[PDB]
A paper describes a structure:
In our structures, we observe a compact stacking of nucleosomes 1 and 3 that is similar to type I interactions with a contact formed between H2A–H2B dimers. The observed stacking does not allow for interactions between the H4 N-terminal tail of one nucleosome with the acidic patch of a stacked nucleosome and thus leaves the H4 tail free to engage in other interactions. Whereas the inter-nucleosome interactions appear to be very similar, we note a slight relative tilting of the stacking nucleosomes that positions their dyad axes almost parallel, in contrast to type I interactions in which the dyads are slightly tilted toward each other. H1 is absent from the stacked nucleosomes of the 4×177 array, but is present on nucleosome 1 in the 4×187 and 4×197 arrays, and is present on both stacked nucleosomes in the 4×207 array. Particularly high Δβ values are found for entry DNA at nucleosome 3, except for the 4×207 array, which is the only array where H1 is observed on nucleosome 3.
Numbering used by the authors:
A (entry chain P), B (entry chain L): 20 to 102
C (entry chain O), D (entry chain K): 37 to 133
E (entry chain N), F (entry chain R), G (entry chain H): 30 to 124
H (entry chain G), I (entry chain M), J (entry chain Q): 10 to 118
The structure:
Amino acid sequence: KVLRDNIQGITKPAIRRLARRGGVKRISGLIYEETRGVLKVFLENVIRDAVTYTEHAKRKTVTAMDVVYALKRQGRTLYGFGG
Amino acid sequence: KVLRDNIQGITKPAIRRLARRGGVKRISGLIYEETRGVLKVFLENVIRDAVTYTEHAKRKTVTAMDVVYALKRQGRTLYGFGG
Amino acid sequence: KPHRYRPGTVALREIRRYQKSTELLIRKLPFQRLVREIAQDFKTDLRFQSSAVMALQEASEAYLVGLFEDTNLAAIHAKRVTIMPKDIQLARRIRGE
Amino acid sequence: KPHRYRPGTVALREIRRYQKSTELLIRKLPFQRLVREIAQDFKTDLRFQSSAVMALQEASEAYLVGLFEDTNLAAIHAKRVTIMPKDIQLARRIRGE
Amino acid sequence: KRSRKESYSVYVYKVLKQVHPDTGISSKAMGIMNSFVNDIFERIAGEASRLAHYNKRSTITSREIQTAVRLLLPGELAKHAVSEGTKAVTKYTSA
Amino acid sequence: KRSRKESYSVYVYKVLKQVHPDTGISSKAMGIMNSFVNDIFERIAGEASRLAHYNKRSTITSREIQTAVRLLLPGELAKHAVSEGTKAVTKYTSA
Amino acid sequence: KRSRKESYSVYVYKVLKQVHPDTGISSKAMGIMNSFVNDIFERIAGEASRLAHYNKRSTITSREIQTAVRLLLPGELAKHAVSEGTKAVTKYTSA
Amino acid sequence: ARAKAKTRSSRAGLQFPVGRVHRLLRKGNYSERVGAGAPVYLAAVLEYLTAEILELAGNAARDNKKTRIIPRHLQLAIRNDEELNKLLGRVTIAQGGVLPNIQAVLLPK
Amino acid sequence: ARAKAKTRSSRAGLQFPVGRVHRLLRKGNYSERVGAGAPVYLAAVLEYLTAEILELAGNAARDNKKTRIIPRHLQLAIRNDEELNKLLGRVTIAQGGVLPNIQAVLLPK
Amino acid sequence: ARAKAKTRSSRAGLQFPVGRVHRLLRKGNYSERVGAGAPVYLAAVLEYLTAEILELAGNAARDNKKTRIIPRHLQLAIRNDEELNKLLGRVTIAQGGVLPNIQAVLLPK
DNA sequence: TAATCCCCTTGGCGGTTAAAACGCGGGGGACAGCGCGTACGTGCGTTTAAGCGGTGCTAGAGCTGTCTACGACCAATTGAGCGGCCTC
DNA sequence: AGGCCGCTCAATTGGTCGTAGACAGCTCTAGCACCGCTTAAACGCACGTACGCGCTGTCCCCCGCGTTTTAACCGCCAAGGGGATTAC
């Protein structure tokens, strides 16, 4: 029922490709796990607010629009999913 | 009654004092004019907002509430001036 | 002799290509499972719209790319081309985090 | 011989002395003259509450201070103690300036 | 049917044909521009509300909106927006 | 002839003497406290308006305000504020 | 036909559901709770009696009980107890 | 005819019975006369201490993945607090066990 | 006996819905009254910004020899206008990619 | 003929005005209608928050052997708490100075 | 929007070292050339769960009559709470 | 100058009222979750190739420092009117 490890599912070549999109030419081996940790922290911050929205909505299925609300709260407003 | 060179009125030892409050030990010679320029830009932004407030308030005297609102709009909210 | 590129060449080609390209670089379904397993860390048995998963995705990669641009700025400010995690923690402190 | 402290000792005495201080580090009259000077460019004959001038003073002082913790975090990141204005520009541009 | 939901597709399309009669548009870009117009609408509306409290004004007028534009929107964009809105409000004032 | 300007001085003085009867105060510290109470009041109130708009609620209730507490107020302070807020609404409904 | 036996059941149940709304109760833990309540009640009551004797006071007020809290309970929880007790007598005199 | 009554527990807004604590004080032979702040102060103190130890019981139960309190959790909560140990040094707990406490010389290597 | 119900957008000579903007401001809780030139002015600002963004998007689509507006074109247009950039610094475009930005120190000799 | 004036702040038992917070929320143009639990909950939250501000101010003043609060005490109170720092990362304080904060690289040897 | 007033700011002035300004012996700082251990981009085969496209379905998303809790508002009245003060 | 204490003022709120808000119930239905299917994308992995990072000694130099000087800052003083505000 429960899942224990899918932060590994954000794989190392995915991080490598993003740092290429992020412009990093050489990536330490120490980078991948701490990037996983800090994105872990940020996603917890986003989804905690999203859950707060979710039972503030009396719903059980999470929608994208509250994700938009939470990201716009955190100063990371995204275009392409509002409404 | 025109004023010309009061950016140098913010003195070099005042810059040293601020960096001591900022915890900077050693300060290059290139620093002081760059600090003068960036504070000039920051002040220009803040008082541009304040002037916009004052003309929209149809006033002539610059008030600290306008300073407070301008700093709020730059994400630099200040406590302690009647806010 | 089989062809082999010097180090950084394929990296620079990748840099050019994913600056050119716009697609997601992380697998969507392990990402989705991560979303669900951290959801149950807050509230169990939550369901997720695939749109919500994707919006969370490009939020995640955009946030990441912003951090890596700041990381590159710190690293070249540290006179470096390889980033080490002190760069990322420094930029995180600079962002006020 | 006159007593002479080594370079950096008086600097650190200034560090502790101005962190324990709470008072303003800018002369009041030339700062007021400067704000009248710059604001006269944007709107003529502008008058300033002296309290508003002091608020501008304190906000500017603290803004430059916060810029300076950003600066010396970049400097210890760049393994230097003599900060140079590329550190400030790094802090600004990573901050988004 | 379903409930009619308001979007800015048709006005973006009319303005697009004003500026580019020849091109098409993706619905993803249409939604991004809908998010844009809603976001900037909320930014300017909230700032006009801020100044309405700052000036203790129970009514937000075009003076307030122009003030908010001069705050948020930078420079030449701000002044040509002033020109465009002034021209539009003179035409609407003259109907 | 003068006009009254409202401030939170007596309440902060009350709770200060409630928590520290022997502790004095300076007026500019009270200026910072007034800035504190107005700043956080506007933060949470804007968040509550956001939640009212998002869930199409024309009424900002206890659920909206506690939702804003869980959003903006982080961690341990949030769960305490939940605890005394629940206590406060409970004893208010008994009042 | 039986006779009522009193306990501290529902009050501890209330405050546990105040601090932990989802946490259950084993009954002999509740017996330990009742015995703890009576034990500490009797300790403080005997302390109030001895202070009443030593001050030659035939009336035991909140000053005696505050003294008893100062005596038995060491430091941190004692000053916390003074805090809610002062707030409680304050709100009770206001009620 | 009569004002509708609130409990003095509700007047304090506290859950412990102020009437019960006051009558157990007056009938406990400590003083024939009791000041008004004494039982409400006592009840506030008691409710705080019970609330604090119940918070310890709840989070200790959540540590052991158990939804409900057990006196093993109460033993762990009393014995791992310094000030509650000072409160209850000589106090015996039914079916509580002890701390997991192994001396350093008892451990191998 | 009413005359022609004319649209206020065309009264402003404009495309953006004056009725929608004015209704949203009446229902958006900013001021209970909104000045008459306020939504007309606001929608004029919106249409001016929208028109220049759509012009940049069409020119960028023509630059990459495409005839349809793409979120990549939106990224490459808006992120390359510095006043639109600092107007929208913390704004994410979904599937827009990033600007092609290689540092000069990263480029070889 | 009339009920006795007993304020809703006293009904909350809290020093923060229920009436003033409620009228500032209603005047603040967030909703025309505000649920009853909202201002009392907000006043409870604010009074709690200002309370731990006041103990942090009090023991900061007690550390510096003055009985009166100075905004240097406020600087030391705010900047030494991580949740208050997260609350006030961007907030500027009048005449507070900074934390006593020196990097380890600045010290001799 | 006309008044206006009074109070709060703006220019002026008679001295003062606090503050700025200045030049100098001086230790520290910054930092590239280059050896040197080394930390990771890279060809490229392999696994397997990811991707794809494919199905029965129901938990909740969303929609629709209800109805009662729910909270704003007006003449009134108050008890708290603020404009003043002075003084320890 | 905190604070305190006598003075005023608007603010706060209770009883009632009239109206709408959203909560709960409830059905419905369409996409989420689930399940079994095929596929080459992912993948991650050990490997030998080329390159990163920060460091010794040095090298050059750059402000930090320590008093002197100085002119204008600061704190005080008497004068003008600006504009900010406030009832209409």
